[PDB]
Amino acid sequence: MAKMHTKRKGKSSSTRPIRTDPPEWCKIGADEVTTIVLDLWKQGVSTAEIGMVLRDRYGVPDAKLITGKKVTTILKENNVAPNIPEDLTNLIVKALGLRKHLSVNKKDVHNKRSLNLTESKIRRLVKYYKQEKVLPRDWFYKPETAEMMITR
Amino acid sequence: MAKGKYAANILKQTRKDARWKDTYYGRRVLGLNVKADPLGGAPQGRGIVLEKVGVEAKQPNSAIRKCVRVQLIKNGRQVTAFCPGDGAVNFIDEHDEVTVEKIGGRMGGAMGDIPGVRFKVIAVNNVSLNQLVIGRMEKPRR
Amino acid sequence: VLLDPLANALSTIKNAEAIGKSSCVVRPASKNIGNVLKVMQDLGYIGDFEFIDDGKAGIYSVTLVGRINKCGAIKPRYSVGTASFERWEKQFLPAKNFGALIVTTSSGVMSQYEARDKKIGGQLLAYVY
RNA sequence: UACCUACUAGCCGACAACGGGUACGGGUUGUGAGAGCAAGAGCCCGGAGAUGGAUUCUGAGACAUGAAUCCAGGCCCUACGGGGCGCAGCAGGCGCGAAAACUUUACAAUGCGGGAAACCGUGAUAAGGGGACACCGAGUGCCAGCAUCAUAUGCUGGCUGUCCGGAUGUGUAAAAUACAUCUGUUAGCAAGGGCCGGGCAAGACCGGUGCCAGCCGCCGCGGUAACACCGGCGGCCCGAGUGGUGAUCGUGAUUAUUGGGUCUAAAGGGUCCGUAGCCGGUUUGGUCAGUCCUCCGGGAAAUCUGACAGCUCAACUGUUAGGCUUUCGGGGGAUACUGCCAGACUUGGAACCGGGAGAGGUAAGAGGUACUACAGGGGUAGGAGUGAAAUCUUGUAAUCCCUGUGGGACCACCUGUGGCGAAGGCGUCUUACCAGAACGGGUUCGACGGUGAGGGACGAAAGCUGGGGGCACGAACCGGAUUAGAUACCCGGGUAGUCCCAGCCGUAAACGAUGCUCGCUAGGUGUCAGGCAUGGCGCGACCGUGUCUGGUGCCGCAGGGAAGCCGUGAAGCGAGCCACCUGGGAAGUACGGCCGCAAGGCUGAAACUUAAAGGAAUUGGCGGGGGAGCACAACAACGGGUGGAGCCUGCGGUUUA
RNA sequence: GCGGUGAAUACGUCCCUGCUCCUUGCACACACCGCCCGUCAAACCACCCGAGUGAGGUAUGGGUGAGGGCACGGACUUCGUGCCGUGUUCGAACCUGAAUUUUGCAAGGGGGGUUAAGUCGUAACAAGGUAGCCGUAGGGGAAUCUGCGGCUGGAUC
RNA sequence: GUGUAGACAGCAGGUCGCAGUGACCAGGGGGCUCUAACUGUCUAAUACCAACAUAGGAGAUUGCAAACCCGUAAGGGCUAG
RNA sequence: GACCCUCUUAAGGUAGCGUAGUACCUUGUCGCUUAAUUGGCGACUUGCAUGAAUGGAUCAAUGAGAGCCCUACUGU
Numbered sequence A: 001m002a003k004m005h006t007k008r009k010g011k012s013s014s015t016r017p018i019r020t021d022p023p024e025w026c027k028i029g030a031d032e033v034t035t036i037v038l039d040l041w042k043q044g045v046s047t048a049e050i051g052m053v054l055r056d057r058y059g060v061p062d063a064k065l066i067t068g069k070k071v072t073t074i075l076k077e078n079n080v081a082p083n084i085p086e087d088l089t090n091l092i093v094k095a096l097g098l099r100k101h102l103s104v105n106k107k108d109v110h111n112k113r114s115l116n117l118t119e120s121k122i123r124r125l126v127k128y129y130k131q132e133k134v135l136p137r138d139w140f141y142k143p144e145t146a147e148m149m150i151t152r
Numbered sequence B: 001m002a003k004g005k006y007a008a009n010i011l012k013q014t015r016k017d018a019r020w021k022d023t024y025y026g027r028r029v030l031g032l033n034v035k036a037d038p039l040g041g042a043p044q045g046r047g048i049v050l051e052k053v054g055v056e057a058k059q060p061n062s063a064i065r066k067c068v069r070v071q072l073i074k075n076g077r078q079v080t081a082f083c084p085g086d087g088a089v090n091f092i093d094e095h096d097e098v099t100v101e102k103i104g105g106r107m108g109g110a111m112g113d114i115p116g117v118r119f120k121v122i123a124v125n126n127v128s129l130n131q132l133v134i135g136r137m138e139k140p141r142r
Numbered sequence C: 001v002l003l004d005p006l007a008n009a010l011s012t013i014k015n016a017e018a019i020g021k022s023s024c025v026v027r028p029a030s031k032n033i034g035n036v037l038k039v040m041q042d043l044g045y046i047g048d049f050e051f052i053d054d055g056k057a058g059i060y061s062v063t064l065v066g067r068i069n070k071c072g073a074i075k076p077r078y079s080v081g082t083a084s085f086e087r088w089e090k091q092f093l094p095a096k097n098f099g100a101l102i103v104t105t106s107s108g109v110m111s112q113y114e115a116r117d118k119k120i121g122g123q124l125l126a127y128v129y
Numbered sequence D: 001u002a003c004c005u006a007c008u009a010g011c012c013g014a015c016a017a018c019g020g021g022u023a024c025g026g027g028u029u030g031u032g033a034g035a036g037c038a039a040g041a042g043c044c045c046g047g048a049g050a051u052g053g054a055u056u057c058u059g060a061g062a063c064a065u066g067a068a069u070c071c072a073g074g075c076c077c078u079a080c081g082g083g084g085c086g087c088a089g090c091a092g093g094c095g096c097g098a099a100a101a102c103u104u105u106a107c108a109a110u111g112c113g114g115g116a117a118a119c120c121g122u123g124a125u126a127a128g129g130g131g132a133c134a135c136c137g138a139g140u141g142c143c144a145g146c147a148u149c150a151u152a153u154g155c156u157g158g159c160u161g162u163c164c165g166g167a168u169g170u171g172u173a174a175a176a177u178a179c180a181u182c183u184g185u186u187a188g189c190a191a192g193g194g195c196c197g198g199g200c201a202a203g204a205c206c207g208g209u210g211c212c213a214g215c216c217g218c219c220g221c222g223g224u225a226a227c228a229c230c231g232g233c234g235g236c237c238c239g240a241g242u243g244g245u246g247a248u249c250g251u252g253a254u255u256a257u258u259g260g261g262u263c264u265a266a267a268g269g270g271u272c273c274g275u276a277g278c279c280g281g282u283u284u285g286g287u288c289a290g291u292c293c294u295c296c297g298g299g300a301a302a303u304c305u306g307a308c309a310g311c312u313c314a315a316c317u318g319u320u321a322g323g324c325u326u327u328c329g330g331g332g333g334a335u336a337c338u339g340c341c342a343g344a345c346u347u348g349g350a351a352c353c354g355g356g357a358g359a360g361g362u363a364a365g366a367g368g369u370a371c372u373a374c375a376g377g378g379g380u381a382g383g384a385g386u387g388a389a390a391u392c393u394u395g396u397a398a399u400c401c402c403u404g405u406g407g408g409a410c411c412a413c414c415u416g417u418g419g420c421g422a423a424g425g426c427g428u429c430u431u432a433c434c435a436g437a438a439c440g441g442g443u444u445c446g447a448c449g450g451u452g453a454g455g456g457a458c459g460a461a462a463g464c465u466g467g468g469g470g471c472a473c474g475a476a477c478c479g480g481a482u483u484a485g486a487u488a489c490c491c492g493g494g495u496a497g498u499c500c501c502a503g504c505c506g507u508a509a510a511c512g513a514u515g516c517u518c519g520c521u522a523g524g525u526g527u528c529a530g531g532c533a534u535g536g537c538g539c540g541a542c543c544g545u546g547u548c549u550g551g552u553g554c555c556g557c558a559g560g561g562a563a564g565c566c567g568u569g570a571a572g573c574g575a576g577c578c579a580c581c582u583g584g585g586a587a588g589u590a591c592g593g594c595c596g597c598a599a600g601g602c603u604g605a606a607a608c609u610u611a612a613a614g615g616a617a618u619u620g621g622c623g624g625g626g627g628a629g630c631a632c633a634a635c636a637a638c639g640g641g642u643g644g645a646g647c648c649u650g651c652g653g654u655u656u657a
Numbered sequence E: 001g002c003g004g005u006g007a008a009u010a011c012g013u014c015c016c017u018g019c020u021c022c023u024u025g026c027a028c029a030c031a032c033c034g035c036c037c038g039u040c041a042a043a044c045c046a047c048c049c050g051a052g053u054g055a056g057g058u059a060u061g062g063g064u065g066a067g068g069g070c071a072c073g074g075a076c077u078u079c080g081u082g083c084c085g086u087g088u089u090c091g092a093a094c095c096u097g098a099a100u101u102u103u104g105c106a107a108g109g110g111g112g113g114u115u116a117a118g119u120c121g122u123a124a125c126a127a128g129g130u131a132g133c134c135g136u137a138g139g140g141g142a143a144u145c146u147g148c149g150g151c152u153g154g155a156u157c
Numbered sequence F: 001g002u003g004u005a006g007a008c009a010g011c012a013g014g015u016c017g018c019a020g021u022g023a024c025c026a027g028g029g030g031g032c033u034c035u036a037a038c039u040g041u042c043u044a045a046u047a048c049c050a051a052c053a054u055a056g057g058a059g060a061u062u063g064c065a066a067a068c069c070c071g072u073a074a075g076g077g078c079u080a081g
Numbered sequence G: 001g002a003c004c005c006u007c008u009u010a011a012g013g014u015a016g017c018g019u020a021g022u023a024c025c026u027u028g029u030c031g032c033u034u035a036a037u038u039g040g041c042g043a044c045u046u047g048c049a050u051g052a053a054u055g056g057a058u059c060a061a062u063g064a065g066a067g068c069c070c071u072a073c074u075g076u
């Protein structure tokens, strides 16, 4: 389909094969992969590339197939998850950096529109998460005060 | 024009606005026809003849169309009335009582090569001007 | 965004019939899609259909035996009773006892002839002929 | 809260409050195949009103149509001290207007109040009179034989009384009609109305009139042969009816949910972000609210449909089987469907990483060449411009050439039927900041999505406000030509402006005249980014062919359109949302409103006018389009003459019987 | 019609002027002697503004305020649905400022339309003779003209 | 009732007069034009104006040993610019 | 009276305003105001002798400024 605010459709999907089982050619275990995930999380590595580094240097095809849990499921099980989802945090971080840039380049109207599109995505994520109880009902996305990196 | 199941309100609203673009429904609801025409929905009328004019016809055709100038008594509206038939101005003169009716032409408006005239005589002194034109009635001396 | 899979499947069947292709694939399969395909198969208008799962919603490899003329969804899915089928039949269908309307009912999904036999109505689903 | 008190600060509304417009509501009526659309005068249900208005007595009940009181308003009887009345009760009158009846009859019946009853009153009701109310039923003729011009009066023959008139009784309260027998009639008393060129059924028959009289819904007729107009002749359709003007329904899929269009005909919003609304993935589990089958309370009759029964057929009344009344309240069954509940699922979108692509954006700087300013050196009669000229410029040494120093704008070739961007738009180079994309991805997420009236930002150029800058260009302006004129094209100057800095306006042929999202549908064919195979490559940085994905163009089958055409990058086939159009002018105008400093933008009629405007395509003519060709009624090259002078003849005009 | 005598020119091209054919353009079909825009004046019609000038409706505060209803007090009679007074209550009518809305009249101004056999030009239609249209700004009796960006819905190159 | 308080604000009933800001005190109001924008200044002793000034707009000179001006000169005003 | 030319010793007054605080003719002509108005306002304007920083038009607010009108008031 088209993108969120640009209508340029694309099909660069990551083709994951039909695997209903863990690997049969790998000796890795669930304890090994969960220990690797916890250690990489404590290093300071976000969940998007935790699985990537599992699949590249350890050749782990999928954490859900072996452990039975995704990365965020393991994070919630071990109390090693953030209080805010990573996508919302990334959008808010980019919006804060873009606002910091736009407070000195007031002619940069194109990036003002880019900031508006990212704000629309941020409000979409907040609406979905408050729909699904991930975030509090009264915590609205304030773009000036309640948008910090770790929100409390 | 929403085709969803629970979208009757949108279709009703868009039909409501699009209806006004028709001339007939909007002019009927707004009451322009009652407000405009001298008879006010009366099929015929009754006015005092004041002046007689043989108004000219259209550009391709060439003729003189006998058109009395009559002022209504029901409303005091001054208009022009076309008197049809051979010897049309012979049976009508100044200061008469003549029934008048619409000419019944294009869109209820002026008919044929008569410019600016929408009303026609149908009877002089409450007797049929058609029969006077034919020759089965005689003009009263009143 | 994909928001009418039954109508998409019937439009694909319409396209495949119009080109005269014997076989065609059905984009993501659904249970109501399978019920419509089974009732259409019992009507004889459609030959064969198999759910080939793909780690997704699933698709169909439908063998069109060349028996239909056009088939799309019924939008909106109108509520219909046992005494309310003939007006929809006169609207969508071309002739009496010619083509059937796919109906969804609490008993089951089926053409409106068998629904009238059941004496139970519901929502119109589609039409095929 | 109906009023009062203490208190609280609510209540209704952008899903339309408040206000304006309009209206007795419904049962129903009009119409159409139906969906619908339009009106709800009369018969029944409820509501209100009694000249407008307020107030009050009486009563079980009233603020009473035949009660009052006063005010306003009009009128009225008076002996002038005073006293009444309001027909939206029945007939009637004036007024009003296009717009409608008798100041009849009776309580006989049906009802009501009164009476214990017998009964009385009843403009309620019934009964009539009058009104081309609506519907229905009939007749003005029938008729054998015979004749022309095929249906008209003929000639003749009789025959019937439905109508009209009478008799008589039934009959109703009594009438009248109706009803029965009889009988009155030479079947005579009883047909009109429109229209005749087309649309549209009917006359190319004869005089009239001459763009006049007239016709004409529209088209169109007549300035000399009118099937058109007037009389006639004839003919046509309808039928005691037949037309006219509105209205309104249908026509018309011309309001379109069913069921329309929106590239070029009216119409896609400049783009885009986005709320209410609306539309939404597969999937396990639970419910059953819409929904579904069923039940029970309703949905007055009337009108509707059919039949039966009875009015002679008929409409009509009763019974009855259906219809409407609808689209309410409440129970049981089902769980497909949608909405509710709790998860999950990976494809849809979201997030991150990789090597690449890009005139993507702001900020800064440097640079390229040309131009220009002044100065210097050389040189000496024109330079500039034009179709041709002149203004202009130059002897104060211009033009041209050389040197040098400043200036502001502008970024060529490279450059592409290339690229990036939401669009507007973006081309010197370097750097910093930011953003998106596609591509690769057993990466994170789990439907988080589409559209989107309102509303918000971006928005070419021109213009406006304030500060700069001003080389060039260049509205205005001035001058020189052109021409009949030139307030224009041409040329010489050249202001505002173009540029920058800080804001405003918010419109373009903002175009692909094609809104955006998804699935689906023959192919051949460039090129661009990425990825991927392979052959060469100094078998390396690199370049070729093939292939998947996403763009960027041409070609075109099926498909569709009225066609030009579109055609996996739809104008094809479905899904969803929005914007938009409804004969041509008047008109994007007037009034009101909001917006802006302003110019203006936004919203947006009516009177009136008009029969077409309009779109594609085509056959010709035509051009100061193109291409081709030809000839002394073309040209070139030539020879002569007409034109000059006199005469001759022809045409015009003066004269002229 | 005939005869005497007797010459230059052109071994041509389609530039000029007619004309023929294919293609392109076209708002032209009486076919370019075509169609056709705006101002100006004249007649008429409908309209808008107009300093002004009336009339009517709705609602609102306020005013003066008939009359009636209960309360209380005071007297006359057959001891009061009466009388006087007082207070309270409802309250018509009329007057008045603003608000709102509907319409009549108005010196004069405006643009629209429509009729002459009007006048002036020639703007668009072909490359309409300077391609045109669109937005914007300025100029001019008037079409329109020029500048700026844009488009091609423009021929020939 | 508010306030700590001074005091302020408000309510119910009764009652007198021709009259309740009872005296004193204390704007009459509105509409259409001309002119100047406004506050201000002005002929002390006949002119309080539409005149003068004003902010706003525009122009000119001058790079400071300046422009402009005073003095015969010494030297000065503008300029501790 | 929308054109060829003038009168052109530089130029022939554009936007506006116009009987004006400017207008002789003059108490200009028409409408509202009044019974009646050399007046006030609006319009027309052939301007003796208007006009753009000799600044033009226009202006909310202000004014012991200058005219006219309505209501209220009063020995004017």
Ligand SMILES: [Mg+2]
Pocket: none
């Ligand atoms: Mg610009």
Ligand SMILES: [Mg+2]
Pocket: none
């Ligand atoms: Mg667009």
Ligand SMILES: [Mg+2]
Pocket: none
């Ligand atoms: Mg008027």
Ligand SMILES: [Mg+2]
Pocket: E139, E145, E146
């Ligand atoms: Mg010009």
Ligand SMILES: [Mg+2]
Pocket: E150
């Ligand atoms: Mg553009």
Ligand SMILES: [Mg+2]
Pocket: F036
């Ligand atoms: Mg002053």
Ligand SMILES: [Mg+2]
Pocket: none
């Ligand atoms: Mg002064």
Ligand SMILES: [Mg+2]
Pocket: none
């Ligand atoms: Mg006076």
